Each structure stands twice: as C-alpha cells, then as structure tokens.
Amino acid sequence: KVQWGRPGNNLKTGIVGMPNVGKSTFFRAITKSVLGNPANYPYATIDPEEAKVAVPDERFDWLCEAYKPKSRVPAFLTVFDIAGLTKGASTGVGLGNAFLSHVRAVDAIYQVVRAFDDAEIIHVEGDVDPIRDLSIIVDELLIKDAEFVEKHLEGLRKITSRGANTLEMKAKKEEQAIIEKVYQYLTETKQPIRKGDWSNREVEIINSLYLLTAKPVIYLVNMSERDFLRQKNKYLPKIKKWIDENSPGDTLIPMSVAFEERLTNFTEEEAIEECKKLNTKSMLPKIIVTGYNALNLINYFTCGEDEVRSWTIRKGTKAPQAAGVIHTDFEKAFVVGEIMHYQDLFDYKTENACRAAGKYLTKGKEYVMESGDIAHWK
C-alpha cells in the first residue's frame, strides 16, 4: 500500500552503536558463523567492512532438498561495519559526523544497545547507562536531519520570490510547505521522521532528503552469555520501555555477542546440541531476517537439477523487473513468465504434478511476484 526509503533491491544495513558495545565483536561474529562466513565463494571477495550474510529461509531449505542441485545459492543481507569504515573516534558525545557520513550510505540501522558492565573493575553506579546513550544517538540523528532540512529549506526560500509567479512557483511552494512540516516534526514533535504520519506525496519528498532519521532501526540489546542464557537482564526492562516512549514499533532483539561468538566454534550440528543443552538458540537467524524484512525485501527462486537460487526483490516488484534481476534481457524481451507458487510446488513435490493440476501458472507483465514464487524465464 505504501513504499518508504531508497529505490531498488540492493539495499544494505549498517551496524550503529556507542563506543564499546560489541560492535566489532558482533561483526566479526557474523562474518565467522555459517551465515556470514565467506563460504559463499562467487569470488566476490567482499570488502573487509562488508559482510554478505545468508538469509535463512526454510523454503530455500526444502527446495534445495527437493531438487538437490549441484549448487545452492541463498539470498543475502548486506551488513556494514560502520565503525570499521572510520578508525576515528568522534570527539563529540555521540557518534560523530564521520561515523554518520557512512551511515547515510546505508538503508537500515542495527543499533547495538549495551546491557552489560563486565568492563568495570570498580563500580561508580551511573557509569554504564544504556538509557542515556539510547537517547544520545536519537538526538544526534534528529539534529543532523534538522540541520539538513533547515539548510535545504533555506535553499527553497530563495526561488520563491513573487512577480509572474503562481504559474509554476506554487508547485515548488507546496514542497516548501511540506519540508516545513518535516522540520516542524524533527524539531517540535522531536521524533524520527520515519514515525510521522505522512502521505504518499510527503513520503516521496522526504525520500529525496535521504534523512538519517528515515531509515528503520533494529535494536540489538547485547548482554552477557550468563544473562542471555537465563532470559533475564539488569537493564532489559528499562531499555524496553524507553523504546516504547521514544521509538515505538522498532524491533528489540535481546542477544549476547559473547554467546553468538562462542557458537561459531561449533559445527552446525554441535551448535544445536549445545543450544539444546543450554536450552536456547542463536539469534543471528532472527536478526538477519528482521533486517531483510525491515528493508521491505522478499524473494523468489529459480530451481533446477543444476542450481537452486533465491533472488532478492522488492515487496511489490512485478514479474518483468523480477526477471530483470537475473539477466537484463529477461525484462526487455519479456512477454510472459512461468510461475509456480511455493505452496503448490511444496504440495506436489514436482513440477509435473502441479503442472498437471494446472498449478504451473503463466504470468505476464502485470504480475506482482509472490514471496517464495518459483519462476522460470525463457
């Protein structure tokens, strides 16, 4: 019904956090697990601060087992190590202008909240406080967007002089009235722009501003293995509420970078046994999915005895474009495509079966792909 954010399919997420929260260890962990391990060898040779994490998807799982292809290529969520992309340690109380300059190149933020204090020799009681840091980042983001708007808004006030006006100026004026509200919000309401109630037009204008406060955010509350293995934390309850009163709706994933890390030392199997004995599970899958989803992404597959690959597309993408994803020609020389809804294929366990039941549908240009769809272009 509505789309927000940057256009396209190759959307990425970056890891945001306050100095010393597990950002680097969290990243190295991802890169080290089965999901982020540079196992995927398309010779892509990812960049050091970039991690291509495999998106978990039982559908992909089944399809792989069903066709048992020589090659299996899962979907991928891009995750950037913002900190790593700038050695500098901001002088400002927050993240800094440099750190942010890199965040801008991202589309979904992974905000690591600290809920551990094992880095303390002596307690000062009030030293390590998440709630404080949580508010800092927000305010820092708001100021930036606020300033950006202010300036940009200042620019539009120029070309607004009357005289032989209202003939085309009124067009740009409506924009100024809106940018005005965007500012109003960022300053008055004092809440991230992604939380306002805007219209399709307003959303459109805003996107052109690439505001920091426009990107969705996913909170990763990093606590100790001990706290995580007992589902109880010291700051968790507090952090939770704060969210509901400052950035409502945003996902809150309690985790333990320490634990995740340790799990990478286990084989896919052992990892399970260990997870069962401790009665718990790795949050990576959950984290990545939440990210992949927050970015409004879905996928369809292309199965075959040779290969089974999951292709990422936007929630409302249509067949032609979807096909374009693989080979540009597919879209150009497009007329029709052969779709096979995951549910049908999963119910018939073979192309022919469902194909015999008519379930081997034939879609044209006006078809919005459906998550899980198994397609085939000619």
UniProtKB/Swiss-Prot annotation:
Q: Which GO terms describe its molecular function?
A: ATP binding; ATP hydrolysis activity; GTP binding; metal ion binding; ribosomal large subunit binding
The OBG-type G domain sits at: 11-275
Named cofactor requirement(s) = Mg(2+)
Identify the residues that bind ATP.
N20, V21, G22, K23, S24, T25, M223
Which Pfam families does this entry report, sorted A to Z?
Answer: MMR_HSR1, YchF-GTPase_C
Q: Which residues does the annotation say bind Mg(2+)? A: S24, T45
Domain TGS per the UniProt entry, residue ranges: 296-378
Lyase as a keyword of this entry, yes or no, is no
Gene Ontology CC terms, in alphabetical order: cytoplasm; cytosol; nucleus
Q: Which locations, inside or outside the cell, does it occupy? A: Cytoplasm; Nucleus
Tell me which UniProt keywords the record has, alphabetically: ATP-binding, Cytoplasm, Hydrolase, Magnesium, Metal-binding, Nucleotide-binding, Nucleus
So which domain of life are we looking at?
A: Eukaryota
Is the keyword Heme in the record?
A: no
Query: Which family does the UniProt entry place this protein in?
Result: Belongs to the TRAFAC class OBG-HflX-like GTPase superfamily. OBG GTPase family. YchF/OLA1 subfamily.
How this chain assembles, per its entry, is: Monomer.
Function per UniProt: Hydrolyzes ATP, and can also hydrolyze GTP with lower efficiency. Has lower affinity for GTP. Negatively regulates the G2/M transition in the cell cycle.
Question: Which PANTHER family does its entry note?
Answer: OBG GTPASE FAMILY (PTHR23305), OBG-LIKE ATPASE 1 (PTHR23305:SF11)
NCBIfam families, sorted? redox-regulated ATPase YchF
Query: By what name is this protein known?
Result: Obg-like ATPase 1
Organism annotation = Schizosaccharomyces pombe (strain 972 / ATCC 24843) (Fission yeast)
Upper taxonomic classification of the species? Eukaryota, Fungi, Dikarya, Ascomycota, Taphrinomycotina
